[PDB]
Design a protein around this ligand. Structure first.
Ligand SMILES: C[As](C)(=O)[O-]
Ligand SMILES: C[As](C)(=O)[O-]
Ligand SMILES: [Br-]
Ligand SMILES: [Br-]
Ligand SMILES: [Br-]
Ligand SMILES: [Br-]
Ligand SMILES: [Br-]
Ligand SMILES: [Br-]
Ligand SMILES: [Br-]
Ligand SMILES: [Br-]
Ligand SMILES: [Br-]
Ligand SMILES: [Br-]
Ligand SMILES: [Br-]
Ligand SMILES: [Br-]
Ligand SMILES: [Br-]
Ligand SMILES: [Br-]
Ligand SMILES: [Br-]
Ligand SMILES: [Br-]
Ligand SMILES: [Br-]
Ligand SMILES: [Br-]
Ligand SMILES: [Br-]
Ligand SMILES: [Br-]
Ligand SMILES: [Br-]
Ligand SMILES: [Br-]
Ligand SMILES: [Br-]
Ligand SMILES: [Br-]
Ligand SMILES: [Br-]
Ligand SMILES: [Br-]
Ligand SMILES: [Br-]
Ligand SMILES: [Br-]
Ligand SMILES: [Br-]
Lengths: 111, 111
C-alpha cells in the first residue's frame, strides 16, 4: 500500500525530530540498515542507540520538500536544518520496505 | 568511484535522449532492472528493445536538476519534458551499480 509506505516514511522523520525512540523502533525492521556517504549502520537496535547517543551533537530538523513514490520504494527530498532554521544540506532518502516497515534507507547528498 | 557512478548515470540519460542504444546497452548490466510505478522491465536486452520500440510514442527530454550521491547509489532529480519543453513530471531515479555499470533504476514520481 503506497499510502501506508508514505505515512511510514513521514513517521520516521517525526520520530527522529521528536526523539520518539519507541515510534522510531516501531517503523523499522529488525535488520534495518541506514546507508549514508560517511557510514553504514546495520541493525535496528544499533541504529536507535546511535540516534539517541548522537542527539546532543546537533539540533536539526528534517522538513520534507517533496515525497516521490515508486513501485515499491519511496524517495523523500528534504532539507536538513540547524537549530536556527538555516539549511545545512539538501538530501534525498530512499526507503525500501519489508512487511510494512522500513528495511533500508539510503541517504544521498548533492554532488 | 563516485565520480564514475555519476558519469555513468549522466550517460544513461544522454543515451535515452539521443537514442544511442549502443551507449545505453553499454552502461547497463545484463540483468538490469528498471522499476517505475506502472511497470517493471527485467533484462538489459528487453529494456533496450522497449526503449527502441516505444520511441515514437512521445518526444521527451530528461534534463537533470540535481544529482545526489550516496555511499554506493546515486539519486537523480530531474524533469521529464515534452517536445515543446513543457514539464510533464518531476522524478527521482535511484541508480544501483554492479561492477561499474547500472544494475537497477527505481523511478519515483511525486505523490
Ligand atoms: C535523533 As538525532 C538526528 O538528534 O541523533
Ligand atoms: C528512448 As524513448 C524514452 O524515446 O522510448
Ligand atoms: Br501520509
Ligand atoms: Br508528520
Ligand atoms: Br504516534
Ligand atoms: Br546514520
Ligand atoms: Br554523510
Ligand atoms: Br561504515
Ligand atoms: Br561513526
Ligand atoms: Br553497523
Ligand atoms: Br532498543
Ligand atoms: Br538505546
Ligand atoms: Br540534547
Ligand atoms: Br515535514
Ligand atoms: Br544544529
Ligand atoms: Br510495504
Ligand atoms: Br559527470
Ligand atoms: Br551528459
Ligand atoms: Br560516447
Ligand atoms: Br520503463
Ligand atoms: Br510510472
Ligand atoms: Br510489470
Ligand atoms: Br507495458
Ligand atoms: Br520484464
Ligand atoms: Br540488443
Ligand atoms: Br532492440
Ligand atoms: Br520517432
Ligand atoms: Br542534463
Ligand atoms: Br511529448
Ligand atoms: Br534503492
Ligand atoms: Br560502482
Amino acid at each position: 500500500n503506497a499510502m501506508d509506505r508514505v505515512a511510514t516514511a513521514r513517521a520516521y522523520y517525526r520520530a527522529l525530530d521528536e526523539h520518539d525512540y519507541d515510534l522510531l523502533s516501531d517503523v523499522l525492521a529488525p535488520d534495518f540498515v541506514h546507508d549514508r556517504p560517511d557510514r553504514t549502520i546495520e541493525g535496528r537496535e544499533r541504529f536507535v542507540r546511535f540516534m539517541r547517543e548522537e542527539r546532543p551533537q546537533t539540533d536539526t530538523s528534517h522538513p520534507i520538500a517533496t515525497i516521490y513514490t515508486g513501485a515499491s520504494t519511496v524517495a523523500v527530498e528534504g532539507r536538513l536544518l540547524n537549530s536556527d532554521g538555516a539549511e545545512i544540506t539538501q538530501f534525498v532518502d530512499v526507503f525500501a520496505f519489508e512487511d510494512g516497515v522500513i528495511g533500508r534507507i539510503r541517504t544521498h547528498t548533492p554532488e
